[PDB]
Coordinates of C-alpha atoms in Angstrom, one line a residue:
Chain V
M1 CA 0.0 0.0 0.0
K2 CA 1.1 3.7 -0.4
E3 CA 0.2 6.8 1.7
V4 CA 1.3 10.4 1.6
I5 CA 1.8 11.7 5.2
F6 CA 1.1 15.2 6.4
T7 CA 1.0 16.7 9.9
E8 CA 0.9 20.4 11.0
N9 CA 3.8 19.5 13.4
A10 CA 6.4 19.6 10.7
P11 CA 7.3 22.2 8.0
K12 CA 4.8 22.5 5.2
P13 CA 6.3 21.7 1.8
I14 CA 5.7 24.7 -0.4
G15 CA 6.9 23.0 -3.6
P16 CA 5.9 19.7 -5.4
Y17 CA 6.6 17.2 -2.6
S18 CA 5.4 15.5 0.5
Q19 CA 6.7 15.3 4.1
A20 CA 6.8 11.5 4.0
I21 CA 5.5 8.6 2.0
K22 CA 4.8 5.2 3.6
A23 CA 5.6 2.5 1.1
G24 CA 4.9 -0.9 2.5
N25 CA 6.6 -1.1 5.9
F26 CA 9.1 1.7 5.0
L27 CA 8.6 5.4 5.6
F28 CA 10.6 7.7 3.4
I29 CA 10.8 11.2 5.0
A30 CA 11.6 14.2 2.8
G31 CA 14.8 16.2 3.4
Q32 CA 14.1 18.2 6.6
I33 CA 15.5 21.7 7.3
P34 CA 15.2 23.9 10.3
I35 CA 11.8 25.5 10.0
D36 CA 9.4 26.0 12.9
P37 CA 6.1 24.4 11.8
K38 CA 3.9 26.6 14.0
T39 CA 5.2 29.8 12.4
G40 CA 6.6 28.5 9.1
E41 CA 9.8 30.6 9.6
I42 CA 13.4 29.4 9.4
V43 CA 15.3 29.4 12.7
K44 CA 18.2 31.8 12.6
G45 CA 20.2 30.2 15.3
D46 CA 23.4 28.2 15.8
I47 CA 23.9 24.7 14.4
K48 CA 22.6 23.1 17.7
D49 CA 19.3 25.1 17.6
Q50 CA 18.8 24.3 13.9
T51 CA 19.7 20.6 14.3
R52 CA 17.3 20.3 17.2
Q53 CA 14.4 21.9 15.2
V54 CA 15.2 19.4 12.4
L55 CA 15.1 16.4 14.7
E56 CA 11.9 17.7 16.3
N57 CA 10.3 17.9 12.8
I58 CA 11.4 14.4 11.8
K59 CA 9.9 13.0 15.0
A60 CA 6.6 14.8 14.3
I61 CA 6.5 13.1 10.9
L62 CA 7.4 9.7 12.4
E63 CA 4.6 10.0 14.9
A64 CA 2.0 11.2 12.4
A65 CA 3.0 8.3 10.2
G66 CA 2.5 6.0 13.2
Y67 CA 6.2 5.2 13.9
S68 CA 8.5 5.9 16.8
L69 CA 12.1 7.0 17.0
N70 CA 13.3 3.4 17.4
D71 CA 11.9 2.6 13.9
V72 CA 14.5 4.8 12.2
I73 CA 17.0 2.7 10.2
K74 CA 18.9 5.1 8.0
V75 CA 19.8 8.8 8.4
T76 CA 21.7 11.0 5.9
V77 CA 23.0 14.2 7.2
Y78 CA 24.0 17.1 4.9
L79 CA 25.8 20.0 6.6
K80 CA 27.0 23.4 5.3
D81 CA 30.8 23.4 5.2
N82 CA 26.2 16.4 19.3
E83 CA 24.4 14.7 22.2
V84 CA 21.3 16.1 20.6
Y85 CA 21.1 12.9 18.4
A86 CA 21.4 10.5 21.3
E87 CA 18.0 11.4 22.8
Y88 CA 16.5 10.8 19.4
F89 CA 18.6 7.9 17.9
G90 CA 19.8 6.3 21.1
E91 CA 17.3 3.4 21.2
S92 CA 17.4 3.4 17.4
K93 CA 21.1 3.4 16.4
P94 CA 20.4 3.8 12.6
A95 CA 23.0 3.4 9.9
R96 CA 24.3 6.9 9.1
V97 CA 25.7 8.8 6.2
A98 CA 27.2 12.3 6.7
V99 CA 28.6 14.7 4.2
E100 CA 29.2 18.4 3.8
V101 CA 28.0 20.3 0.8
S102 CA 28.0 23.8 -0.9
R103 CA 24.5 25.0 0.1
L104 CA 21.2 23.8 1.4
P105 CA 17.7 25.0 0.5
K106 CA 17.1 28.5 2.0
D107 CA 20.8 28.9 3.1
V108 CA 20.2 26.7 6.1
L109 CA 23.0 25.0 8.2
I110 CA 21.7 21.4 8.2
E111 CA 19.4 19.1 6.3
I112 CA 18.4 15.5 7.2
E113 CA 16.5 12.8 5.3
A114 CA 15.4 9.6 7.1
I115 CA 14.0 6.2 6.5
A116 CA 12.1 4.1 9.1
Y117 CA 10.8 0.5 9.3
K118 CA 8.0 -1.2 11.2
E119 CA 7.0 -4.9 10.9
Chain F
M1 CA 13.5 -11.1 -6.6
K2 CA 16.3 -9.0 -8.0
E3 CA 16.2 -7.7 -11.5
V4 CA 18.2 -5.4 -13.7
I5 CA 16.3 -2.8 -15.8
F6 CA 17.6 -1.7 -19.2
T7 CA 16.2 0.5 -21.9
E8 CA 17.4 2.1 -25.1
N9 CA 15.6 5.3 -24.3
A10 CA 17.9 6.1 -21.4
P11 CA 21.6 6.8 -21.3
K12 CA 23.7 3.6 -21.3
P13 CA 25.4 3.0 -17.9
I14 CA 29.2 3.1 -18.0
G15 CA 31.0 0.5 -16.0
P16 CA 29.8 -2.2 -13.5
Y17 CA 26.5 -0.5 -13.0
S18 CA 22.8 -0.5 -14.1
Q19 CA 20.2 2.1 -15.0
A20 CA 17.9 0.7 -12.4
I21 CA 17.1 -2.4 -10.3
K22 CA 13.8 -3.8 -9.2
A23 CA 14.2 -5.4 -5.7
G24 CA 10.8 -6.7 -4.5
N25 CA 8.2 -4.0 -5.1
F26 CA 10.9 -1.3 -5.0
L27 CA 12.5 0.2 -8.0
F28 CA 15.9 1.8 -7.4
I29 CA 16.9 4.2 -10.2
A30 CA 20.5 5.2 -10.6
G31 CA 21.2 8.9 -10.8
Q32 CA 20.5 10.5 -14.1
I33 CA 22.2 13.4 -15.8
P34 CA 21.0 15.5 -18.8
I35 CA 22.4 13.2 -21.5
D36 CA 20.2 12.8 -24.5
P37 CA 20.1 9.1 -25.3
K38 CA 19.8 9.7 -29.0
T39 CA 22.6 12.3 -29.5
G40 CA 24.8 10.8 -26.7
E41 CA 25.7 14.2 -25.3
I42 CA 24.4 16.9 -22.9
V43 CA 21.5 19.0 -24.0
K44 CA 21.4 22.8 -24.8
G45 CA 23.1 24.0 -21.6
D46 CA 20.2 25.6 -19.8
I47 CA 18.8 24.4 -16.4
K48 CA 15.2 24.1 -17.8
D49 CA 16.3 21.9 -20.7
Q50 CA 18.7 19.9 -18.6
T51 CA 16.0 19.3 -15.9
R52 CA 13.7 18.1 -18.6
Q53 CA 16.1 15.6 -20.2
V54 CA 16.9 14.1 -16.8
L55 CA 13.2 13.7 -16.0
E56 CA 12.6 12.2 -19.5
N57 CA 15.4 9.8 -18.8
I58 CA 13.9 8.8 -15.5
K59 CA 10.5 8.4 -17.1
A60 CA 11.9 5.9 -19.7
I61 CA 13.5 3.7 -17.1
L62 CA 10.3 3.7 -15.0
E63 CA 8.4 2.8 -18.2
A64 CA 10.9 0.1 -19.0
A65 CA 10.3 -1.5 -15.6
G66 CA 6.5 -1.3 -15.9
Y67 CA 6.2 1.6 -13.5
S68 CA 4.7 5.1 -13.9
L69 CA 5.5 8.5 -12.6
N70 CA 2.9 8.3 -9.8
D71 CA 4.8 5.3 -8.4
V72 CA 7.8 7.4 -7.6
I73 CA 8.0 7.9 -3.8
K74 CA 11.4 9.5 -3.2
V75 CA 13.5 11.8 -5.3
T76 CA 16.9 13.3 -4.5
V77 CA 18.1 16.3 -6.5
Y78 CA 21.8 17.4 -6.8
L79 CA 22.4 20.9 -8.2
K80 CA 25.6 22.8 -8.9
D81 CA 24.8 25.9 -6.8
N82 CA 21.1 29.3 -7.4
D83 CA 18.9 27.8 -10.2
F84 CA 16.9 25.9 -7.7
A85 CA 13.7 27.6 -8.9
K86 CA 13.3 26.9 -12.6
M87 CA 14.1 23.2 -11.9
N88 CA 10.8 23.0 -10.0
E89 CA 8.6 24.3 -12.9
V90 CA 9.7 21.4 -15.1
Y91 CA 9.7 19.0 -12.1
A92 CA 6.1 19.9 -11.3
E93 CA 5.0 18.6 -14.7
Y94 CA 6.2 15.1 -13.8
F95 CA 5.6 15.0 -10.1
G96 CA 3.2 17.9 -9.4
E97 CA 0.4 15.5 -8.6
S98 CA 1.9 12.4 -6.8
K99 CA 4.3 14.7 -4.9
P100 CA 7.1 12.3 -4.0
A101 CA 9.2 12.8 -0.8
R102 CA 12.1 15.1 -2.0
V103 CA 15.6 15.9 -1.0
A104 CA 17.4 18.9 -2.6
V105 CA 21.0 19.9 -2.0
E106 CA 23.6 21.9 -3.9
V107 CA 27.1 20.5 -4.5
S108 CA 30.5 20.9 -6.0
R109 CA 30.8 19.0 -9.2
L110 CA 28.5 16.5 -10.9
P111 CA 29.2 13.9 -13.6
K112 CA 30.5 15.6 -16.8
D113 CA 30.0 18.9 -15.1
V114 CA 26.2 18.9 -15.7
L115 CA 23.9 21.3 -13.7
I116 CA 21.6 18.7 -12.3
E117 CA 21.4 15.0 -11.5
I118 CA 18.4 13.2 -10.1
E119 CA 17.9 9.8 -8.4
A120 CA 14.6 8.1 -7.5
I121 CA 12.9 5.3 -5.8
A122 CA 9.6 3.9 -7.1
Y123 CA 7.1 1.7 -5.4
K124 CA 4.4 -0.5 -7.0
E125 CA 2.2 -2.8 -4.8
Chain K
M1 CA 12.2 -7.9 11.0
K2 CA 14.7 -5.2 12.2
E3 CA 18.2 -6.2 13.2
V4 CA 21.4 -4.0 13.7
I5 CA 24.5 -5.6 12.1
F6 CA 27.9 -5.6 13.7
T7 CA 31.4 -6.8 12.8
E8 CA 34.8 -6.1 14.4
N9 CA 36.1 -6.3 10.8
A10 CA 34.5 -2.9 10.0
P11 CA 35.2 0.4 11.7
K12 CA 33.7 0.5 15.3
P13 CA 30.5 2.5 15.3
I14 CA 30.9 5.8 17.3
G15 CA 27.8 7.4 18.8
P16 CA 24.2 6.3 18.5
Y17 CA 24.7 4.5 15.2
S18 CA 25.2 1.1 13.6
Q19 CA 27.4 -0.1 10.7
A20 CA 24.2 -1.4 9.2
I21 CA 20.6 -2.2 9.8
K22 CA 18.7 -5.1 8.3
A23 CA 15.0 -4.4 7.6
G24 CA 12.9 -7.0 5.9
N25 CA 14.9 -8.2 2.9
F26 CA 16.9 -5.0 2.9
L27 CA 20.3 -4.2 4.3
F28 CA 21.0 -0.5 4.8
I29 CA 24.8 0.0 5.3
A30 CA 26.1 3.2 6.9
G31 CA 28.6 5.5 5.1
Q32 CA 32.0 3.8 5.1
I33 CA 35.2 5.8 5.2
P34 CA 38.8 4.6 4.6
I35 CA 39.4 3.7 8.3
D36 CA 41.5 0.6 8.8
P37 CA 39.4 -1.5 11.3
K38 CA 42.7 -2.9 12.8
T39 CA 44.5 0.4 13.6
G40 CA 41.5 2.7 13.8
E41 CA 43.5 5.3 11.8
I42 CA 43.0 6.4 8.2
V43 CA 44.8 4.1 5.9
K44 CA 47.9 5.6 4.2
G45 CA 47.9 6.3 0.5
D46 CA 45.9 8.1 -2.2
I47 CA 42.3 7.8 -3.4
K48 CA 43.1 4.3 -4.6
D49 CA 44.1 3.0 -1.2
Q50 CA 41.2 4.8 0.4
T51 CA 38.8 3.2 -2.2
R52 CA 40.1 -0.2 -1.6
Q53 CA 39.7 0.2 2.2
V54 CA 36.1 1.5 1.9
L55 CA 35.0 -1.3 -0.3
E56 CA 36.7 -3.8 1.9
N57 CA 34.8 -2.5 4.9
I58 CA 31.5 -2.7 3.0
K59 CA 32.2 -6.3 2.1
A60 CA 32.9 -7.0 5.8
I61 CA 29.5 -5.6 6.9
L62 CA 27.9 -7.5 4.1
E63 CA 29.2 -10.9 5.1
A64 CA 28.4 -10.3 8.7
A65 CA 24.8 -9.9 7.8
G66 CA 24.7 -13.0 5.7
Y67 CA 24.7 -11.1 2.5
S68 CA 26.8 -11.1 -0.7
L69 CA 28.4 -8.6 -3.0
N70 CA 26.0 -9.9 -5.5
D71 CA 23.2 -8.5 -3.2
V72 CA 24.2 -4.8 -3.5
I73 CA 21.4 -3.1 -5.4
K74 CA 22.3 0.5 -5.1
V75 CA 25.6 2.4 -4.4
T76 CA 26.1 6.0 -3.5
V77 CA 29.6 7.4 -3.8
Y78 CA 30.7 10.7 -2.3
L79 CA 34.1 12.2 -3.5
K80 CA 35.9 15.4 -2.3
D81 CA 37.3 17.0 -5.5
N82 CA 38.7 2.0 -11.8
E83 CA 39.2 -1.8 -11.8
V84 CA 38.5 -1.9 -8.1
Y85 CA 34.8 -1.4 -8.8
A86 CA 34.5 -4.2 -11.3
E87 CA 35.9 -6.6 -8.7
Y88 CA 33.3 -5.7 -6.1
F89 CA 30.3 -4.8 -8.3
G90 CA 30.7 -6.6 -11.6
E91 CA 28.4 -9.3 -10.3
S92 CA 25.7 -7.2 -8.7
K93 CA 25.8 -4.3 -11.2
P94 CA 24.0 -1.9 -8.8
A95 CA 22.3 1.4 -9.7
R96 CA 24.8 4.2 -9.2
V97 CA 24.8 7.8 -7.8
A98 CA 28.1 9.7 -7.7
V99 CA 28.8 13.3 -6.6
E100 CA 31.5 15.6 -5.3
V101 CA 31.2 17.4 -2.0
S102 CA 33.0 20.0 0.1
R103 CA 34.3 17.5 2.6
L104 CA 33.9 14.1 4.3
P105 CA 34.2 12.9 7.9
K106 CA 37.8 13.0 9.2
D107 CA 38.6 14.9 6.0
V108 CA 38.9 11.7 3.9
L109 CA 38.7 11.5 0.1
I110 CA 35.8 9.2 -0.4
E111 CA 32.7 7.9 1.4
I112 CA 30.5 5.1 0.0
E113 CA 27.0 4.1 1.2
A114 CA 25.1 1.0 -0.1
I115 CA 21.9 -1.0 -0.1
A116 CA 21.6 -4.8 -0.6
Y117 CA 18.7 -7.1 -1.1
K118 CA 18.2 -10.8 -0.5
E119 CA 14.9 -12.7 -0.8

């Protein structure tokens, strides 16, 4: 089965894409950036405040999709050229990919895309 | 089961790789660049035309594997720094309705120095 | 079923992460860098000795999960700025994505992520 996920607790995609799609038992979450869902405005803070907003958004999507943090299996982290993660990926310990790039959408510091599983 | 997807309407993969692979109900498409399968070279040189060729390439592979555009669930887009606006206009033609999960990031260099490269994952139950 | 994969033959996982997660018939392997599992230090040499090392680590994680190089269905290669590949992927002929980025972890020259399938 296939379902497009959408909750008001994570940034609202403005372009042609969804927050997350549940395909079978896998959940593919779109690249997340630091945007406060309630206000729709990008946080202009330090890497830790931005990274926390991102992880908060991902969690919102996981929850709306009916998953929990320990269902997360793979995380790709893109940074603009961290105990924060442990409270989120501690009981999960997903496989990780991390790279630095030129720029992210809306000149943000960090972007994260995730995949989760649930039997 | 595992299966290699090949089509004449998409650029031929160079080396020990494939255009796409169907594993179970998932279709993993290799990254595509704006190479016109008929001419064998990059198109015009403008973001719009390049984004179109890439999407056309992706469409062919999907079509070759018996999938459609609305089966695409995740797309990752790599750009070479800011033209990340026109890309969406062409992109909406192909994914405006099904709205796949997206990931967009800008990088250093892409294969053959193109301006855009896109990879996708499709799902068919 | 969800199972984290582990092998002493690959670089020890630092932080809240795994070398790989097995979900359903899929194996999601974390980004691998040219770290010599034995010494824990970056292997000496150029992009060729780093490539070898990376692919070797991937192979290690694969075998520890009961998978084969013929199982690799998708490969994502990050570079900073060859016959080895035919040896490791001439049998699986996976879908490929390759790009260049600003920098990799521990400022290495190459990072490779991968996905494998086994029915």
